[PDB]
Amino acid sequence: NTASIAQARKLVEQLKMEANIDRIKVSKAAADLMAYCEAHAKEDPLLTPVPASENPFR
Amino acid sequence: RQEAEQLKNQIRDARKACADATLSQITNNIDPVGRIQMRTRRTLRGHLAKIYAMHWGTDSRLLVSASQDGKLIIWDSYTTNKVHAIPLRSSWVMTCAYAPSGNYVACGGLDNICSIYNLKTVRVSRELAGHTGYLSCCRFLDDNQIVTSSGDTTCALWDIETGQQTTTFTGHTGDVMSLSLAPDTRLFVSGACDASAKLWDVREGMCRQTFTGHESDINAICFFPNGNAFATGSDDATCRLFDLRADQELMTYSHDNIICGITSVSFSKSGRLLLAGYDDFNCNVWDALKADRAGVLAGHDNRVSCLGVTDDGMAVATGSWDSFLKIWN
Amino acid sequence: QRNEEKAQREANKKIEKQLQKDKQVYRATHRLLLLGAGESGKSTIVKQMRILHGIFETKFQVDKVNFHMFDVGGQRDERRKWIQCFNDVTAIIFVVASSSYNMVIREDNQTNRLQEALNLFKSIWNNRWLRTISVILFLNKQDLLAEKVLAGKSKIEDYFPEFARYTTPEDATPEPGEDPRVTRAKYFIRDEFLRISTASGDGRHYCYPHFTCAVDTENIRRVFNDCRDIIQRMHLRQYELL
Amino acid sequence: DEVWVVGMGIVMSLIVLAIVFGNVLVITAIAKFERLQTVTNYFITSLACADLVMGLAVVPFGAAHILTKTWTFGNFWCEFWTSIDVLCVTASIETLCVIAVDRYFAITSPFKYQSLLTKNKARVIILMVWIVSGLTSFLPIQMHWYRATHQEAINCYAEETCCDFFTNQAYAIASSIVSFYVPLVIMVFVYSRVFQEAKRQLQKIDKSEGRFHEHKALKTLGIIMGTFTLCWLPFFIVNIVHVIQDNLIRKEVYILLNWIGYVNSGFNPLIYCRSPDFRIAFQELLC
Ligand SMILES: Nc1nc2c(ncn2[C@@H]2O[C@H](COP(=O)(O)OP(=O)(O)OP(=O)(O)O)[C@@H](O)[C@H]2O)c(=O)[nH]1
Numbered sequence: 001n002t003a004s005i006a007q008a009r010k011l012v013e014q015l016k017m018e019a020n021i022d023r024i025k026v027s028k029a030a031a032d033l034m035a036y037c038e039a040h041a042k043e044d045p046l047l048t049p050v051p052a053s054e055n056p057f058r
Numbered sequence: 059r060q061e062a063e064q065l066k067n068q069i070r071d072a073r074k075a076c077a078d079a080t081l082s083q084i085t086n087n088i089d090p091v092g093r094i095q096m097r098t099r100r101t102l103r104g105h106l107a108k109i110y111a112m113h114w115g116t117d118s119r120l121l122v123s124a125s126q127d128g129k130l131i132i133w134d135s136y137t138t139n140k141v142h143a144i145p146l147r148s149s150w151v152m153t154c155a156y157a158p159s160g161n162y163v164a165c166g167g168l169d170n171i172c173s174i175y176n177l178k179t180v181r182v183s184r185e186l187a188g189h190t191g192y193l194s195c196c197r198f199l200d201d202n203q204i205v206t207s208s209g210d211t212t213c214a215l216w217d218i219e220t221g222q223q224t225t226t227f228t229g230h231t232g233d234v235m236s237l238s239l240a241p242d243t244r245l246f247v248s249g250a251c252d253a254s255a256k257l258w259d260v261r262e263g264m265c266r267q268t269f270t271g272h273e274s275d276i277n278a279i280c281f282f283p284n285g286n287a288f289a290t291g292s293d294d295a296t297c298r299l300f301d302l303r304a305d306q307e308l309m310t311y312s313h314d315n316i317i318c319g320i321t322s323v324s325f326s327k328s329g330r331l332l333l334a335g336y337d338d339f340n341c342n343v344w345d346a347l348k349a350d351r352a353g354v355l356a357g358h359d360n361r362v363s364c365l366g367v368t369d370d371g372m373a374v375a376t377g378s379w380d381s382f383l384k385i386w387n
Numbered sequence: 388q389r390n391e392e393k394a395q396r397e398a399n400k401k402i403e404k405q406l407q408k409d410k411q412v413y414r415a416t417h418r419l420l421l422l423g424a425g426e427s428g429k430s431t432i433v434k435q436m437r438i439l440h441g442i443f444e445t446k447f448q449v450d451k452v453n454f455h456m457f458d459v460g461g462q463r464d465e466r467r468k469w470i471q472c473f474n475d476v477t478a479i480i481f482v483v484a485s486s487s488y489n490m491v492i493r494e495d496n497q498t499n500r501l502q503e504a505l506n507l508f509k510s511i512w513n514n515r516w517l518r519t520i521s522v523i524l525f526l527n528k529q530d531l532l533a534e535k536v537l538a539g540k541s542k543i544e545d546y547f548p549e550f551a552r553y554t555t556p557e558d559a560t561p562e563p564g565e566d567p568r569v570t571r572a573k574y575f576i577r578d579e580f581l582r583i584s585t586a587s588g589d590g591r592h593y594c595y596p597h598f599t600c601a602v603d604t605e606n607i608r609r610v611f612n613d614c615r616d617i618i619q620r621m622h623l624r625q626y627e628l629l
Numbered sequence: 630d631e632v633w634v635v636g637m638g639i640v641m642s643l644i645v646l647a648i649v650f651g652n653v654l655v656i657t658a659i660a661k662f663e664r665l666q667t668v669t670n671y672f673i674t675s676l677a678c679a680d681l682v683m684g685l686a687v688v689p690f691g692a693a694h695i696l697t698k699t700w701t702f703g704n705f706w707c708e709f710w711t712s713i714d715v716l717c718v719t720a721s722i723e724t725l726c727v728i729a730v731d732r733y734f735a736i737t738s739p740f741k742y743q744s745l746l747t748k749n750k751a752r753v754i755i756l757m758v759w760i761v762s763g764l765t766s767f768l769p770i771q772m773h774w775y776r777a778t779h780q781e782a783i784n785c786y787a788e789e790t791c792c793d794f795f796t797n798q799a800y801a802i803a804s805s806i807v808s809f810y811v812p813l814v815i816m817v818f819v820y821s822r823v824f825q826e827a828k829r830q831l832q833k834i835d836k837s838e839g840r841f842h843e844h845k846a847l848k849t850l851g852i853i854m855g856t857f858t859l860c861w862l863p864f865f866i867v868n869i870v871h872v873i874q875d876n877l878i879r880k881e882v883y884i885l886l887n888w889i890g891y892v893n894s895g896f897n898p899l900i901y902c903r904s905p906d907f908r909i910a911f912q913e914l915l916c
């Protein structure tokens with residue numbers, strides 16, 4: 001099967017392309033997620049119940 | 059062609075080399091948000107058959123839903139009264155979408171055709187064909203181009219004006235079931251039935267990364283508001299949180315008392331709460347940064363198949379096989 | 388904004404009326420699902436019925452009762468993820484080629500073609516989402532099976548070793564002129580499926596075996612009778628009486 | 630003596646309660662959940678409402694009258710109480726007949742069941758049944774067409790202390806025919822047809838797949854028919870007998886059989902509400 005060679009090479013070129021990516025430590029990613037969540041924590045009605053005056057479904 | 063294992067081993071070693079610490083270690087002194095109680099505010103009726111999908115409007119006021127009766131109904135959440143009702147040619151529909159500009163509505167299903175509608179004229183505008191399998195999801199990237207995912211292990215980026223495929227994404231092995239667009243509409247992800255997810259490029263049209271943390275079929279996928287993470291839900295009663303920059307998963311959401319599958323996943327505006335619908339006739343509200351339950355949304359008498367949160371984050375709406383749409387808060 | 392509220396209330400009324408009009412039509416009709424193995428003759432059976440009196444649809448009525456049938460041939464794969472959508476149908480029509488007990492398929496040695504059907508039927512019966520759906524079974528190609536069994540070149544016993552220790556049922560009703568070999572082959576084919584059906588029936592859904600060939604015009608009546616029986620049995624069991 | 634009066638109060642208290650509790654639970658369960666709002670459940674709602682009215686109105690005052698041995702209210706109250714009794718009793722049986730006919734249509738003709746029964750038609754049927762029941766209770770009692778013609782009857786009618794049931798032949802026969810004998814032959818014929826269909830279906834199943842593999846229908850039909858027949862039969866024959874020939878039945882036997890009839894409202898929730906959905910509803914709340 002010539003087709004088999006094609007898929008086998010494509011799985012090799014794709015894997016080579018999907019291997020040379022700069023990676024960062026997971027601690028930095030967790031810190032960034034923490035910072036964003038703490039930054040935008042005061043603007044979501046689900047987390048903090050808003051007064052019934054501004055609620056359109058009341 | 060025996061070098062494929064070597065590259066996989068190298069990728070695994072590179073991923074292991076950057077695992078400095080677990081997310082739970084960093085987020086351990088945070089005071090939990092505590093129990094959260096939500097009550098039904100509205101109940102929408104009128105669907106003869108059992109529902110699959112829904113999509114909120116961009117104004118957080120209107121929403122659309124599709125059912126197996128062969129009918130799309132555009133509701134008004136504030137005054138719980140209908141606006142439009144569109145009969146369809148084929149009664150087997152599996153998806154729906156709402157335009158960012160509020161002018162078009164798309165819906166496709168078991169027939170290998172994606173149809174769009176012109177609300178402000180209600181007649182069919184164009185029919186997009188070319189797929190060889192059932193459609194599973196579709197989203198408007200803009201007012202003139204749409205991205206769809208079908209059951210023949212492919213995705214496409216259509217052009218509405220000409221009705222011809224522009225770019226075709228290939229590389230998956232199993233059926234593609236769901237996708238979600240980034241806030242900048244420059245990248246999107248997709249969850250297949252081969253227990254894998256991928257991060258495509260809209261412009262170039264080449265896959266960049268592959269995550270294979272799951273072990274069964276993937277039914278739902280969402281995307282973090284920050285644009286640097288996403289969450290998936292599979293049939294093994296687990297929700298996993300991946301990260302693009304680190305390139306491996308960071309946290310798993312599972313409980314020993316639930317063994318049913320997951321049908322929908324969504325986030326909140328702040329991203330602190332993760333909402334996931336189950337086959338247990340109800341829904342759960344996890345904690346994104348702590349992996350601990352925080353509430354249950356009961357009230358449905360059958361399977362839950364839809365879920366969504368408004369853009370302004372004022373309410374969360376669900377749709378089940380009981381042919382009823384409910385609005386929680 | 389008095390008109391704006393009033394106008395919306397005008398539209399909701401126009402729809403609700405349309406929905407009420409359409410509900411009766413939706414509830415009146417009956418839906419069936421057509422399914423079977425490849426190279427078995429489902430297309431021949433469907434095309435023949437109308438002249439007699441990615442998806443496909445068919446409309447037909449018997450005794451002023453509306454019936455509707457959907458067949459899916461575009462989505463042909465071993466894994467069937469779309470089958471969850473068909474848990475509210477009245478019945479499932481299953482068609483299998485009864486004469487192909489000696490033929491490998493796909494240029495793949497595979498298994499004798501009848502066995503693959505058996506595996507498909509077993510998977511369909513034990514599905515989680517089809518716990519309360521009956522099955523109508525059509526054993527097609529009755530003449531080719533009889534001729535092939537009459538020929539001594541191909542023997543059923545070789546491919547299925549359990550045929551050697553098989554004895555015909557005492558309640559059989561062979562057609563006039565039928566040789567014992569044809570009757571034994573037919574009833575072995577029938578009870579091979581009946582065993583799988585009755586193993587885990589649980590009393591909620593049954594099976595209706597049938598024999599048919601090309602020259603037959605009574606299938607449209609058999610489907611009607613089977614659907615009526617299915618609904619009657621469902622109603623009887625609902626009231627804790629059967 | 631002293632013990633008998635004490636015994637009656639306890640026995641009466643247990644019945645008045647059970648009767649109210651069963652109907653209240655059924656009505657609350659059917660109203661709370663939308664899964665149980667089936668069209669065939671409307672007849673059950675009407676039956677439960679009728680039983681609730683009977684248990685709340687006629688049982689307590691009847692017990693008070695039988696215990697006190699003297700009516701303590703006016704003649705108009707006596708007539709109104711008799712009217713309520715007759716209305717509830719005659720409206721608690723035609724609903725059973727309607728339920729039987731509905732099951733007959735559901736089983737015998739499965740294809741035409743959807744068209745023959747609609748939510749709009751159920752309200753019309755229920756209203757017609759209630760109108761017919763009210764026509765034979767208030768109309769011939771508020772008007773004085775049911776009165777008797779012997780000295781004891783007129784003496785009791787003049788007095789304001791005795792409230793006893795005296796009637797002539799015509800009203801007794803007509804009310805008995807309207808209430809009991811007409812809705813009995815219909816039920817018998819319907820259930821015979823249903824049993825025949827069930828036996829035929831089971832025979833077909835046994836013929837089809839007997840080799841690899843009778844009394845449930847008998848048990849269910851026996852419960853449904855026997856409970857009602859045993860509860861309401863003797864009264865609706867002594868009613869004719871005592872007026873056809875006098876000085877044959879003592880009043881105590883009359884009252885005892887009539888009160889035996891009242892217990893029938895204490896079994897309907899246990900008979901017509903045994904579906905698993907009702908069990909789930911009962912477990913969800915008040916538990
Ligand atoms: N002798 C005989 N041949 C039959 C019969 N039914 C179908 N055939 C033959 O089967 C062929 C037609 O089958 P089709 O209906 O086209 O097959 P199909 O159902 O589309 O097959 P798949 O889509 O692969 O499942 C012809 O060669 C027919 O002569 C039958 O009852 N007797």
Ligand SMILES: CN[C@@H]1CCc2c(ccc(O)c2O)[C@H]1O
Pocket residue numbers: 714715718719794801804805808887
């Ligand atoms: C005193 N109690 C009454 C008397 C006669 C009567 C009853 C019930 C139904 C009828 O059709 C009747 O005629 C009894 O409940």
